[PDB]
From a paper:
Interestingly, these searches identified four putative LIR motifs that are located between residues 4–7 (4FPVI7), 59–62 (59FYNV62), 238–241 (238WIPV241) and 261–264 (261FVEV264) in the NSs sequence. LC3 proteins carry out their various functions during autophagy in part due to their ability to interact with other autophagy factors that contain LIR motifs.
The ITC experiments demonstrated that the NSs4 bound with sub-micromolar affinity to all six of the human LC3-family proteins under the experimental conditions (20 mM Phosphate pH = 6.5 and 50 mM NaCl) with the exception of GABARAPL2 which bound with low micromolar affinity. However, crystals were obtained by fusing NSs4 to the N-terminus of either GABARAP or LC3A, a method commonly used to examine the structures of LIR motifs with LC3-family protein. In complex with NSs4, both LC3A and GABARAP adopt the canonical Atg8 fold, similar to what has been observed in previously reported structures of their free forms as well as in other structures of fusion proteins with LIR motifs. In addition to the interactions involving F261, the side chain of V264 of NSs4 forms hydrophobic contacts with the side chain of F52 (5.3Å), V54 (4.3Å), P55 (4.1Å), V58 (6.8Å), L63 (6.8Å) and I66 (3.9Å) in HP2 of LC3A whereas, the corresponding hydrophobic interactions in HP2 of GABARAP occur between the side chain of V264 of NSs4 and the side chains of Y49 (4Å), V51 (4.1Å), P52 (4Å), L55 (3.7Å), F60 (4.5Å) and L63 (3.4Å).
Author numbering: -6 to 119
The structure:
C-alpha cells in the first residue's frame, strides 16, 4: 500500500502560488530597478474555457502606455482572429476604456503587494 503519488502543474492564480511577502518584495525590487514601469499580472479568468492559458502571466510595461497597448500585447500572444473578441478586466469584473492610461489604472486599482492584477476572458463567458 504505497502512496500513489500524483503530481501535476498548478493552475492556481499568481496570488496563491507566491506568498504575500515574496510578492511585495518582488514589486519593491522591480519598482526600484524600473521606477517608470508597471508590474502587471495578467491571467485567464476563472470561468474562461474558450481561450487558452498563456505561458507568461507577469508583464512589465512602460507607465506611459494606455490600456489599449495591453490589449494588443495579450491579443497577439493569444494569436486571435479578428472574429475572436475578448475582454481585459482590471482586478476582477472591472472594465475600463482602452484609452485609459495604465498609470491611472495602477494607482487606483493596484493590489497591496504592488502588482496590478488583470484577467482576460471571452465576451461570451459573461
Amino acid at each position: 500500500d504505497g502512496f500513489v503519488e500524483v503530481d501535476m502543474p498548478s493552475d492556481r492564480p499568481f496570488k496563491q502560488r507566491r506568498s504575500f511577502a515574496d510578492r511585495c518584495k518582488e514589486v519593491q525590487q522591480i519598482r526600484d530597478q524600473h521606477p517608470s514601469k508597471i508590474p502587471v499580472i495578467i491571467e485567464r479568468y476563472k470561468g474562461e474555457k474558450q481561450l487558452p492559458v498563456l505561458d507568461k502571466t507577469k508583464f512589465l510595461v512602460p507607465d506611459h502606455v494606455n490600456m489599449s497597448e495591453l490589449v494588443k500585447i495579450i491579443r497577439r500572444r493569444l494569436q486571435l482572429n479578428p472574429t475572436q473578441a475578448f475582454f481585459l478586466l482590471v482586478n476582477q469584473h472591472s472594465m475600463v476604456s482602452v484609452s485609459t492610461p495604465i498609470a491611472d489604472i495602477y494607482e487606483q486599482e493596484k493590489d497591496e503587494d504592488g502588482f496590478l492584477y488583470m484577467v482576460y476572458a471571452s465576451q461570451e463567458t459573461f
